[PDB]
């Protein structure tokens, strides 16, 4: 028999000026799955179903969980509960974001920012599209590993202090790493205009190499290292 405590951020938008408060729950860990989501689900099912959160895959590929657990941003479905009964787990919504309800942040801006980099392949001549597979050597292809696997979970950008103070105009690591993913895609023709789109104070340059992003990626990616690669490209490119 093993009880664990969970301190969980709460807020009901329909409860007339309800104020954000922590609610604590208790879970027999022998009666629960290894991961934090398993507990989040178990309390939803048996204890309180007024608890509201985003989940889907429970396998860590949809990037639906993405919340603040014990100070760090990962995916609940992938983060395992600390067997240490002495520590009380503290579950929060993703930092410096608007809470719609409980652990549910308004991710609209995060998405709008992703749209803005135009995250798709672009050719100068698009007449011949649809009819032949494009050439790309494994060499040109290796340059994509650790970039394409991004889950758009928003753990990174939402851990970046620069994104906290300047989330509106600063694109943040997740988006920025993607713009780079398309920059180094051999099949893309618009590398110069992708860079030229980041010529302002805020879009790229609010990054001060804090490195929370890489430090927190639940997928073990290095958004920050890509941000520095963009920076080099920004300085050295022509026209």
């Amino acid at each position: 028999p093993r009880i664990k405590k969970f301190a969980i951020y709460r807020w009901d938008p329909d409860k007339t000026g309800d104020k954000p408060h922590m609610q604590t729950y208790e879970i027999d860990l022998n009666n629960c799955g290894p991961m934090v989501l398993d507990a989040l689900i178990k309390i939803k099912n048996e204890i309180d179903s007024t608890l509201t959160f985003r989940r889907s895959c429970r396998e860590g590929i949809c990037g639906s969980c993405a919340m603040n657990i014990n100070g760090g941003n990962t995916l609940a479905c992938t983060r395992r509960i600390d067997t240490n009964l002495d520590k009380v787990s503290k579950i929060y919504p993703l930092p410096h974001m608007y809470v719609i309800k409980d652990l549910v942040p308004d991710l609209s801006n995060f998405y709008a920012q992703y749209k803005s980099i135009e995250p798709y392949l672009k050719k100068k001549d698009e007449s011949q599209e649809g009819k032949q597979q494009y050439l790309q050597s494994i060499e040109e292809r290796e340059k994509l590993d650790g970039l394409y696997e991004c889950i758009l979970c928003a753990c990174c950008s939402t851990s970046c202090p620069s994104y906290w103070w300047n989330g509106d105009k600063y694109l943040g690591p997740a988006v920025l790493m993607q713009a780079y993913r398309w920059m180094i895609d051999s099949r893309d023709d618009f590398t110069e205009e992708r860079l030229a789109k980041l010529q302002d104070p805020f879009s790229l340059y609010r990054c001060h190499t804090i490195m929370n992003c890489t430090g927190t990626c639940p997928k073990g990616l290095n958004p920050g290292k890509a941000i520095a690669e963009i920076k080099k490209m920004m300085a050295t490119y022509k026209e």
Binding site: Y9, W11, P13, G17, P20, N68, N70, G71, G72, K90, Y92, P93, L94, P95, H96, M97, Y98, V99, I100, P105, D106, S108, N109, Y111, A112, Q113, K115, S116, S159, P161, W164, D168, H208, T209, I210, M211, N212, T214, G215, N222, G224, K225, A228, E229, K231, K232
Partner: protein, 138 residues
């Protein structure tokens, strides 16, 4: 709906709501490279304040540097209080110096992996101490 309209919509929705912003600094777990980052901010801000205060007092205050040095020899401080006032000036400087080097290695793209940040973090921290004590001893 454009990306810009979407952003524009995001702000006008939320600023006219009663939604709370989720906690951040007050909850987010600090790490060695995170702390070493605001310290780069602080030390820089302090160092610039020092220099600003130096050139500004050179324009407003009467008497030369030599006048102010003798002015200081008044109620002359203990060797272990002139060294303290000496160490608390090279510490802000020597730190921001070594981490600034680290920031440039980074601009070059070298050593940006997490375990490399825990290595480059300690090495800067030690070099700070060794060069802060080294210089206040001169």
């Amino acid at each position: 709906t454009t990306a810009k309209e979407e952003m524009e919509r995001f702000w006008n929705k939320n600023l006219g709501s009663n939604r709370p912003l989720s906690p951040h600094i007050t909850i987010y777990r600090w790490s060695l490279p995170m702390a070493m980052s605001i310290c780069h901010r602080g030390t820089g801000i302090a160092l610039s304040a020092g220099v600003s205060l130096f050139g500004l007092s050179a324009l407003l205050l009467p008497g030369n540097f030599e006048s102010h040095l003798e002015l200081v020899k008044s109620l002359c401080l203990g060797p272990t209080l002139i060294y303290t006032a000496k160490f608390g000036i090279v510490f802000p400087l020597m730190y921001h110096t070594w981490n600034g080097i680290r920031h440039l290695i980074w601009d070059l793209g070298k050593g940006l992996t997490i375990p490399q940040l825990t290595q480059s973090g300690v090495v800067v921290l030690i070099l700070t101490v060794l060069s802060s004590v080294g210089l206040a001893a001169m």
